[PDB]
Amino acid sequence: FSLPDIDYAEQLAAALKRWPLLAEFAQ
Amino acid sequence: FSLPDIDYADISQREQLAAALKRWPLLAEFAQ
Amino acid sequence: AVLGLQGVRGGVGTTTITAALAWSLQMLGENVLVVDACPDNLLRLSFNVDFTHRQGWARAMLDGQDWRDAGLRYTSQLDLLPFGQLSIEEQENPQHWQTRLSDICSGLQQLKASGRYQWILIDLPRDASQITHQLLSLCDHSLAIVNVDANCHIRLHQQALPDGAHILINNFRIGSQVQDDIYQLWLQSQRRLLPMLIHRDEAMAECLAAKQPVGEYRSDALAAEEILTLANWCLLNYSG
Amino acid sequence: AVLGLQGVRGGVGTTTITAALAWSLQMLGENVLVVDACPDNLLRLSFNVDFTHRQGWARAMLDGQDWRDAGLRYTSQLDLLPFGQLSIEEQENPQHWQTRLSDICSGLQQLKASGRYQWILIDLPRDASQITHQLLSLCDHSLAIVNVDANCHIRLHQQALPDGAHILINNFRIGSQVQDDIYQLWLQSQRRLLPMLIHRDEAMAECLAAKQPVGEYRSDALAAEEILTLANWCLLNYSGLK
Numbered sequence: 001f002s003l004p005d006i007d008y009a010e011q012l013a014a015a016l017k018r019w020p021l022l023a024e025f026a027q
Numbered sequence: 028f029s030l031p032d033i034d035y036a037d038i039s040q041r042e043q044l045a046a047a048l049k050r051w052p053l054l055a056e057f058a059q
Numbered sequence: 060a061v062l063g064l065q066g067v068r069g070g071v072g073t074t075t076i077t078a079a080l081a082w083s084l085q086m087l088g089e090n091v092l093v094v095d096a097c098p099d100n101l102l103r104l105s106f107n108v109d110f111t112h113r114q115g116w117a118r119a120m121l122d123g124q125d126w127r128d129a130g131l132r133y134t135s136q137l138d139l140l141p142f143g144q145l146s147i148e149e150q151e152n153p154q155h156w157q158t159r160l161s162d163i164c165s166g167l168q169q170l171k172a173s174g175r176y177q178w179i180l181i182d183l184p185r186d187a188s189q190i191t192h193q194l195l196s197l198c199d200h201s202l203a204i205v206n207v208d209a210n211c212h213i214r215l216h217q218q219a220l221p222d223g224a225h226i227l228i229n230n231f232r233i234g235s236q237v238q239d240d241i242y243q244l245w246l247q248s249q250r251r252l253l254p255m256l257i258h259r260d261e262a263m264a265e266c267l268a269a270k271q272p273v274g275e276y277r278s279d280a281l282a283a284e285e286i287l288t289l290a291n292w293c294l295l296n297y298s299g
Numbered sequence: 300a301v302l303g304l305q306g307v308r309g310g311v312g313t314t315t316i317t318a319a320l321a322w323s324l325q326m327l328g329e330n331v332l333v334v335d336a337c338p339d340n341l342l343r344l345s346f347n348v349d350f351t352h353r354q355g356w357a358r359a360m361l362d363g364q365d366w367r368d369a370g371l372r373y374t375s376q377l378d379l380l381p382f383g384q385l386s387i388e389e390q391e392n393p394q395h396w397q398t399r400l401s402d403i404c405s406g407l408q409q410l411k412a413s414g415r416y417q418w419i420l421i422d423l424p425r426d427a428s429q430i431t432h433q434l435l436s437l438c439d440h441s442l443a444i445v446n447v448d449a450n451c452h453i454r455l456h457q458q459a460l461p462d463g464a465h466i467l468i469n470n471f472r473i474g475s476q477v478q479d480d481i482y483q484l485w486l487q488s489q490r491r492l493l494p495m496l497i498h499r500d501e502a503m504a505e506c507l508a509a510k511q512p513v514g515e516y517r518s519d520a521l522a523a524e525e526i527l528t529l530a531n532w533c534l535l536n537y538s539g540l541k
């Protein structure tokens with residue numbers, strides 16, 4: 001049991017600026 | 028905690044329900 | 060009045076509705092405390108609480124701290140009590156702490172008796188833990204949240220709901236004959252079904268990503284109006 | 300191989316996907332056993348088991364009986380092991396039984412060693428009970444079922460999945476700005492994502508009401524075709540044992 005393997009390292013920037021929840025996990 | 032109050036007495040009275048009960052064996056099962 | 064909200068299965072919209080109903084009750088002039096009783100600790104994210112903010116009533120209780128210091132002020136009318144963030148190990152061993160939380164029941168009983176809030180809304184998980192049972196026992200009323208699908212249809216014939224609960228439909232949508240058939244059947248047979256429902260609505264999907272209750276996020280969203288109808292009904296029928 | 304399916308939260312489609320995937324594997328020639336490990340005991344209803352049929356592997360254990368007598372044959376190559384119907388007293392008192400069911404693990408481990416099935420699929424509940432963890436440990440591979448929404452997005456950053464699980468999207472339909480934003484985000488960031496998904500499809504809503512797996516109910520539905528693709532992917536990638 002472990003946390004999912006998530007790698008946050010063009011239109012993603014739009015989604016991140018649209019949604020504060022998504023920006024939070026991404027940085 | 029109790030099971031939900033469900034009454035199937037007045038079901039077989041509207042043709043819209045009768046067609047759905049014929050379509051869906053799951054719903055007919057609980058109703059009858 | 061203490062109002063419990065509990066999905067008849069996971070994922071039906073219980074938490075989003077709890078945050079939205081609290082906001083609506085506030086817009087109607089009421090004082091509200093919202094309590095997250097779910098270990099998932101998701102309610103706080105509808106009130107712009109930082110994901111990394113780990114405090115909450117259970118987190119404090121397990122850490123040997125005063126659970127009453129974990130409450131947060133959202134507006135002058137709306138306070139929030141998150142559950143708190145459990146570690147992975149805690150999440151996978153509920154038997155290690157589920158009995159260490161029983162003081163919340165007496166604590167919430169004190170809060171109820173004080174009349175500090177006009178409404179306490181409790182987002183309740185769908186487990187059979189003693190604490191879920193005891194929190195339900197201090198609720199004056201409760202809403203069982205469903206979606207109109209064959210799964211919830213079966214569940215309503217085999218599992219217990221909180222005594223006196225009314226049934227609230229969420230996620231009602233266009234494009235499903237089987238949904239419409241089950242819905243018409245419920246209208247004739249489900250005695251505790253509420254006379255209003257909530258549609259699937261892009262505002263209910265977006266407001267969590269915007270970290271706001273639906274009525275703050277889009278005050279003129281159809282779903283915000285549907286929640287307001289729910290809030291008015293609660294004022295009229297659930298005030299005792 | 301033993302395959303666990305477990306939703307990242309309730310209601311994401313785990314049981315319907317389990318029944319459909321079992322049907323697809325059976326159609327590909329595999330002998331399959333499907334086991335319901337959920338106390339809800341819902342899986343049986345995708346296989347035309349009467350609601351009043353209370354027997355199941357767990358019901359049999361609690362009643363001091365043989366769990367092997369609770370199996371049901373759906374086709375010559377697909378067998379079913381229901382959980383069994385719990386009374387309301389049992390449902391709301393899990394401490395009375397969730398420690399008395401551990402015999403199912405050595406029973407299934409023996410069944411696995413016998414090789415009578417090519418696939419044992421286990422519909423697992425979204426709880427952390429001992430019996431869920433133990434059954435998870437018997438699985439060779441596992442599928443973590445999600446829907447594309449903000450709730451599942453949060454859960455993927457804060458809760459554990461079974462180790463080595465892949466993530467299977469269910470109920471997807473483009474058109475929602477926020478869901479499409481999350482979806483595109485997962486595509487670039489969720490390393491355990493499967494290359495196929497299951498669309499929202501009224502065949503998946505209707506088949507449970509018809510008490511059938513989606514592939515038997517409507518074989519040319521898009522979701523049935525997608526489940527078939529998952530079945531072929533399992534045969535190619537999940538065939539090895541732990």
Ligand SMILES: Nc1ncnc2c1ncn2[C@@H]1O[C@H](COP(=O)(O)OP(=O)(O)OP(=O)(O)O)[C@@H](O)[C@H]1O
Pocket residue numbers: 066068069070071072073074075076097099101229230231257258259260261263264265266267282308309448449450451
């Ligand atoms: N009416 C609706 N229309 C569209 N999206 C909705 C609606 N209601 C809820 N959602 C979305 O569904 C997801 C799950 O909702 P929510 O977290 O409120 O459900 P829940 O029953 O509390 O879930 P859980 O089992 O995690 O406690 C969220 O991403 C939410 O934004």
Ligand SMILES: Nc1ncnc2c1ncn2[C@@H]1O[C@H](COP(=O)(O)OP(=O)(O)OP(=O)(O)O)[C@@H](O)[C@H]1O
Pocket residue numbers: 068069208209210211306308309310311312313314315316337339341469470471497498499500501503504505506507522
């Ligand atoms: N892809 C889909 N398209 C349309 N409806 C679907 C789809 N997948 C599932 N459903 C419907 O969603 C409901 C819940 O599905 P299901 O019971 O498989 O989910 P679950 O995760 O196992 O639920 P539970 O939390 O009760 O165990 C059912 O009515 C089912 O018919």
Ligand SMILES: [Mg+2]
Pocket residue numbers: 073074075097101
């Ligand atoms: Mg919730």
Ligand SMILES: [Mg+2]
Pocket residue numbers: 313314315337341422
């Ligand atoms: Mg299920």
